Every structure is written in C-alpha cells, then in structure tokens.
Design a protein around this ligand. Sequence first.
Ligand SMILES: [Zn+2]
Ligand SMILES: [Zn+2]
Length: 195
Amino acid sequence: AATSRTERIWPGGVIPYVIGGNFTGSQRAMFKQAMRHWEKHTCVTFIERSDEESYIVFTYRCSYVGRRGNGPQAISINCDKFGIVVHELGHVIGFWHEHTRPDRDNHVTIIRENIQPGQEYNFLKMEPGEVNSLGERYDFDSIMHYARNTFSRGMFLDTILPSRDDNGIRPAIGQRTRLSKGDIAQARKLYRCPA
Ligand SMILES: [Zn+2]
Ligand SMILES: [Zn+2]
C-alpha cells in the first residue's frame, strides 16, 4: 500500500528527525536501530534535524503516512519494541497498511462481524487514486500487514483471513521482526533508488 502521492515522498530520500530528551539510552538506541534497518536496505537516510521545517519527532505519546509538510510530525511510541518502530517508520516513509491495498480482496477476506464495533474503518480499502503498488505483488510478510486478529472482538475470532496458496497454505500475517523482501523491493521503487 505505497502512497501514490509525490508530495508525500520525502525529497531526496532524506528524513530529518529529533528524538525527545525523555527517552532512555536504551529506547534511543532502539529507535536508531529501527532507522538503520530501513537505511541499510534502501536509499532512505535519516539525519538529525538542523533547521528543517518538516521532520519526524519521536514522542512517548499509527503514524501519519509520508511527509505531511509545513511542520513536524510525530512518530508516537507496551509498544516499545524494534519491530513496532520499524512498522511506524514504514508509515513515515510512505506506506499504508498492506491489507488496505486496492487489490486486497484477491488475497484476504475481511471478517467484518468479528471487528470491534467502531474499528471497522481500519479495514477499508484505500481509494485507487491513493495507492500505487508499483507493480509489486500483495505481500503477506510485510511489516505493514495486520495480524489475523487485529481489532478482534474476541479470543480466537479472526478479522483477516488470508487466501490459500496453490499448496493450500494460508500465509502467516502480522510479523513484527524485520522488513520483508517485498517491503525492501517496494521501498526501493518508491524512492527511485539506484540499482
Ligand atoms: Zn500501522
Ligand atoms: Zn507492500
């Protein structure tokens, strides 16, 4: 679910940041590891803010998707773990949730009756004008994919049911351990990274 909007892409692949003075040494080091994980695999670079008007700020307060412009934007951190921060950074860079891709019905079923009332909006498709997948296949392993029971109203009730592949296996969804091969390949296309 890559943003289609040029204005939301960070110019030059550079994302200035500030980390709040309230975070511990451990939390700061973790934010830097999550930033570095995106950098190592793409042409995005995170730099300490100097004078930029628009930048991300880590605050103990999901993130805005892409560059809002005209000012700072929060990356608002029990959600205090590396993979959660890599997911939020995916929002910063320009990705919506994978299951909201305009083509998602070919890949998952949303079980609306199992969603906590008032949370159904989290499962709507993005309008086709707002996402350009860049030719990339739907990615069940994306760091941006919800788990099977996100916003579920109860124990064992799924809100997302992935389609079986030709081997009859429903792919696992919702990992928060590392960028998938598809997240990397798609971010490289989005930022027009050199080969
Ligand atoms: Zn999110
Ligand atoms: Zn994707």
